[PDB]
Amino acid sequence: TFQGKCTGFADKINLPNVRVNFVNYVPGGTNLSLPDNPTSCGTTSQVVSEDVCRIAMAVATSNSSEITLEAWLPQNYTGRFLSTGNGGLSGCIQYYDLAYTSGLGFATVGANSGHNGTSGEPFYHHPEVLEDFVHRSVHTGVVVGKQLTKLFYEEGFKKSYYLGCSTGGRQGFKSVQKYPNDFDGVVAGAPAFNMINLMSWSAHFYSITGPVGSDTYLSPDLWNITHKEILRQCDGIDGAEDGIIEDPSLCSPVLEAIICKPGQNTTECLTGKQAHTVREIFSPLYGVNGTLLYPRMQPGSEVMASSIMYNGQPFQYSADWYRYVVYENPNWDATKFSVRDAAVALKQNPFNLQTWDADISSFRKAGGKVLTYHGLMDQLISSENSKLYYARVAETMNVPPEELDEFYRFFQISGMAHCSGGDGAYGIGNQLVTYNDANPENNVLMAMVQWVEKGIAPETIRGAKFTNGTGSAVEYTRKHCRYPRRNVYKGPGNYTDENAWQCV
Ligand SMILES: *[C@@H]1O[C@H](CO)[C@@H](O[C@@H]2O[C@H](CO)[C@@H](O)[C@H](O)[C@H]2NC(C)=O)[C@H](O)[C@H]1NC(C)=O
Ligand SMILES: *[C@@H]1O[C@H](CO)[C@@H](O)[C@H](O)[C@H]1NC(C)=O
Ligand SMILES: *[C@@H]1O[C@H](CO)[C@@H](O)[C@H](O)[C@H]1NC(C)=O
Ligand SMILES: *[C@@H]1O[C@H](CO)[C@@H](O)[C@H](O)[C@H]1NC(C)=O
Ligand SMILES: *[C@@H]1O[C@H](CO)[C@@H](O)[C@H](O)[C@H]1NC(C)=O
Ligand SMILES: *[C@@H]1O[C@H](CO)[C@@H](O)[C@H](O)[C@H]1NC(C)=O
Numbered sequence: 001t002f003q004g005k006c007t008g009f010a011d012k013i014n015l016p017n018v019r020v021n022f023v024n025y026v027p028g029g030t031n032l033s034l035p036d037n038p039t040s041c042g043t044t045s046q047v048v049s050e051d052v053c054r055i056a057m058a059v060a061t062s063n064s065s066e067i068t069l070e071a072w073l074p075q076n077y078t079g080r081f082l083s084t085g086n087g088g089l090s091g092c093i094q095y096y097d098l099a100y101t102s103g104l105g106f107a108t109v110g111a112n113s114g115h116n117g118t119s120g121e122p123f124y125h126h127p128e129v130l131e132d133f134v135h136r137s138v139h140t141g142v143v144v145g146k147q148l149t150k151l152f153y154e155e156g157f158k159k160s161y162y163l164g165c166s167t168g169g170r171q172g173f174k175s176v177q178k179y180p181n182d183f184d185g186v187v188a189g190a191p192a193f194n195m196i197n198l199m200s201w202s203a204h205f206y207s208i209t210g211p212v213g214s215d216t217y218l219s220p221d222l223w224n225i226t227h228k229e230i231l232r233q234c235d236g237i238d239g240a241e242d243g244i245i246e247d248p249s250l251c252s253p254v255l256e257a258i259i260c261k262p263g264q265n266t267t268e269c270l271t272g273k274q275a276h277t278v279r280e281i282f283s284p285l286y287g288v289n290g291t292l293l294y295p296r297m298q299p300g301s302e303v304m305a306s307s308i309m310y311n312g313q314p315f316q317y318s319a320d321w322y323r324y325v326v327y328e329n330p331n332w333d334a335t336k337f338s339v340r341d342a343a344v345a346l347k348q349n350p351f352n353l354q355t356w357d358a359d360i361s362s363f364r365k366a367g368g369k370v371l372t373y374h375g376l377m378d379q380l381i382s383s384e385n386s387k388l389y390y391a392r393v394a395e396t397m398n399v400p401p402e403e404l405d406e407f408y409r410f411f412q413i414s415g416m417a418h419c420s421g422g423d424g425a426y427g428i429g430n431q432l433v434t435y436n437d438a439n440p441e442n443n444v445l446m447a448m449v450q451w452v453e454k455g456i457a458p459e460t461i462r463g464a465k466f467t468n469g470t471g472s473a474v475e476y477t478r479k480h481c482r483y484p485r486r487n488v489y490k491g492p493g494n495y496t497d498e499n500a501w502q503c504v
């Protein structure tokens with residue numbers, strides 16, 4: 001029996017520097033309690049919809065570091081191994097991804113990145129813990145996970161896959177760049193690569209806005225006013241007035257247009273200083289010496305960005321990065337961030353956390369495929385940074401898109417926010433929360449499986465716009481384009497007909 005194989009499995013595990021905490025049979029329909037999950041992760045449970053054997057481990061990665069590692073080995077197994085990854089500066093195992101991919105038949109692992117919780121404080125004075133976050137946590141879970149898969153199933157595994165977004169997107173690219181043989185297929189969303197500069201750019205928003213109530217700051221109401229004017233200026237460039245900017249690279253908005261006139265209600269317009277703030281927010285971050293560090297925030301992400309990036313407080317992840325790693329001073333004042341700090345951080349680049357190597361020929365040579373996607377109203381990580389990486393790879397590898405298409409495809413997703421949510425057709429199946437069925441035509445993960453196992457490369461990636469979230473009726477779908485193409489509404493038929501659009 002499958003249960004009996006699982007209850008007998010702890011005795012079969014004997015791996016150096018791996019301590020088995022427990023092995024449990026978890027039937028489908030179980031609502032797992034996760035009492036030990038770090039409180040800052042904000043998840044104490046996970047529904048597991050299909051039978052798995054659950055293995056939980058503590059794996060020492062050095063004499064002063066360890067990861068927590070979970071492996072969920074499904075009863076209904078397809079012969080495919082998969083690793084998940086992390087979010088933010090967190091060690092949070094993404095149990096929602098473990099449920100998702102195990103439920104699709106993958107032998108699945110996820111590790112906590114080498115520490116517990118969403119704070120960067122565990123990096124403080126602990127280079128081995130930081131090294132786990134940069135590269136060694138994900139890789140260790142792949143090595144151990146593959147071992148466990150082969151121990152548990154007579155058939156072993158035929159192919160190996162990666163699924164992650166945000167920090168998880170970065171970790172997918174760290175795999176491509178440093179461990180070209182870890183995965184046959186890598187699915188990496190909205191990647192936090194160019195990571196050091198991402199922290200600097202996150203930190204620089206405070207220097208532009210200033211604190212809540214200052215001259216230079218905009219309230220959430222004013223960011224809503226600003227959003228509506230951005231749509232007036234840009235929504236229709238793609239040919240459809242649908243509240244979505246299909247490719248914001250064509251949107252260069254001019255916000256002096258909504259500077260207050262005499263006799264205008266001050267709550268519906270900007271002062272000159274506020275307009276200057278907005279112009280700078282849609283400008284790139286350049287460093288000492290006048291070199292580019294991070295591209296502009298793409299227009300369209302204003303409502304959620306007002307709460308997270310433009311809220312008049314220093315962004316927390318970057319403050320943590322500068323206090324605990326760059327300067328090792330927990331009292332470092334993040335309100336006084338300057339580009340001189342960004343130079344110090346970029347030169348430090350610990351364990352090449354930048355994850356910005358543009359020569360990925362070793363991955364190509366090993367036979368790997370990578371599919372990356374990025375939402376074009378992303379409020380946390382600008383979609384333009386993925387576009388910059390693409391240019392850099394083409395330039396460095398000295399090949400055009402037709403050649404890159406053989407092993408590296410990048411889809412730009414209209415109306416998607418950071419990793420999930422947004423105003424438009426974000427339902428591409430990168431996570432349970434974006435799921436529109438399991439079939440490759442509707443699901444990015446299964447599309448990678450098809451590319452790897454049948455040699456069928458995805459031309460576009462379909463997403464759903466839901467009436468009221470995943471599981472509700474699909475209102476419309478759209479076939480998102482493969483960069484450098486963009487989507488343009490041509491008709492015939494209304495913009496809700498996916499056939500009325502063309503990638504151009
Ligand atoms: C980090 O969090 C994990 C839980 O996600 C902790 O692992 C648990 O620790 C206790 C105490 O050793 C074990 O008895 C449990 O079986 C563990 N749970 C799992 C899922 O493995 C881990 O201890 C924490 N790491 C620390 C504090 O270093
Ligand atoms: C699982 O349990 C938690 C409480 O621990 C609850 O919030 C969640 O809705 C449950 N899920 C289902 C679908 O029963
Ligand atoms: C701990 O590990 C470090 C880093 O790998 C190593 O150089 C050092 O010798 C070790 N110290 C002990 C106490 O084992
Ligand atoms: C701004 O607009 C969004 C819809 O895009 C709305 O849900 C939100 O409540 C508005 N925010 C404020 C502060 O009015
Ligand atoms: C300006 O707008 C607010 C709504 O934001 C309204 O309550 C207030 O009465 C208006 N003031 C004037 C002078 O029109
Ligand atoms: C196209 O569909 C949208 C979505 O409901 C709607 O706003 C619009 O009226 C439709 N256009 C026509 C011509 O029916």
Ligand SMILES: COc1cc(/C=C/C(=O)O)ccc1O
Binds near residue numbers: 292356392
């Ligand atoms: C990190 O080093 C590099 C940066 C670039 C950047 C090009 C650009 O930023 O416009 C190009 C090649 C490099 O080796």
Ligand SMILES: [Ca+2]
Binds near residue numbers: 242
């Ligand atoms: Ca539009």
